[PDB]
Amino acid sequence: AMEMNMADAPLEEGLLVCTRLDQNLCAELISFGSGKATVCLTPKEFMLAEDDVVHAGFIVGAASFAALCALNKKNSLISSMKVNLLAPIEIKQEIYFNATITHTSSKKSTIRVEGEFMEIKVFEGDFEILVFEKRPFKFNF
Template identity: 30%
Template sequence: MEIKTHSKIDQSLCGEPVIQEQGRSKVRLVCTPNMEADESGLVHGGFIFGLADYAAMLAVNEPNVVLAAAESQFLKPTRVTDELIAKANDTTPTQRKHLVQVEVFCKDELVFTGMFTCFVTKQHVLADS
């Protein structure tokens, strides 16, 4: 399926699509040293959130999809060299307001979960700026 959204995203920071189908996506991210928050190798949570957000956008896959809100939980720490897989499922695919459930795994362990509220706008949010 053709990816219709976020065409200029830096996939080295937000993940590489593995599966993109109507209403769902799977995105892979390898955590690199530039994501490190401290000397222990802990990855900053913003990169994990970015991965989950990108997976949610791909599950909706509309050119003008935007994030309105998110409820999320970081369940386990992530380290440099970890490979993360985000799985997103649009639970309301026929509506203008999309609720997208996202889970991020490291190996078989759930490290993040979130519900992303996304809207598809009639025009790009920056169209009148």
Template identity: 30%
Template sequence: MAKNKMSLAQEALENTPSFEDEAESTEELLNDTTFLNDELKTHGKIKSTFAGNLVELKKNSAKVMLQTTNEMVVDEFGLIHSGFIFASAEYAAISAVNEENLVIIGCRSKFFAPAKVGDLITFEAKGRFEEARKREIKVIGMINEIKVFEGIFQAVILEHHILQTKIDELQATINSKELS
């Protein structure tokens, strides 16, 4: 008797290598590059489990690798939620600029192919306009030789952290009202 779609999908998901199965093959690469996070001037508390691992950092370029896991799955087929892919691409973009008070202000992106649990996605980011406060960063995400993501991110470098700037402005407003 033929198996129904649900049982076939569940079987495929169970037979897909998990992060733990793939960990040994990528562990050396990821462990050898953990020092890069010390060189990164922004996003110091980002969770690599969901945004990927920074594996290469050069002036105006960066490479991030995202190992997809069961925690990212949205259905019984093992499809990865595109938000994790986008987050990893954004992480590559901000890493390529590598400035302390960097804020992403826009993005044009395309998803070309789906990712499934167990995939290792490599994001390469290249920044432009290095002398300006406003930057443009192109990010391409690949699974092996297949392009799954491409985006052009726009970013701006602020003088202060974006949240601190608003707090300072609010404090100044409060102080001026108290003096009145």
């Protein structure tokens, strides 16, 4: 599409997934394509579980968004994950989550995601994503 070759084209242009996701409650999308994606979470006050601890839902949520963008397949959703939250995150800390597809088939894909703070790994997880033929999704179950 032309509106993707304009040097000013919005980043989200070719994204086929997370169509209703408010990035302000998740992470800012930085890049995607070629089986990878990067998103950046700078935690906000509303994301805290404790004074000095960002709630796991926002850490895993940011990683989930990167994983989905790395595959970028219409009609996909996260089906399973195994994740390690290596360190507690505080407000203001910028965390980059880098997703890379590690296995793929027409049906199912595994996406590995690492979250880094100042180039130090603070998060790692593998996400399984399934791709369906029908929407809404519930028709497939």
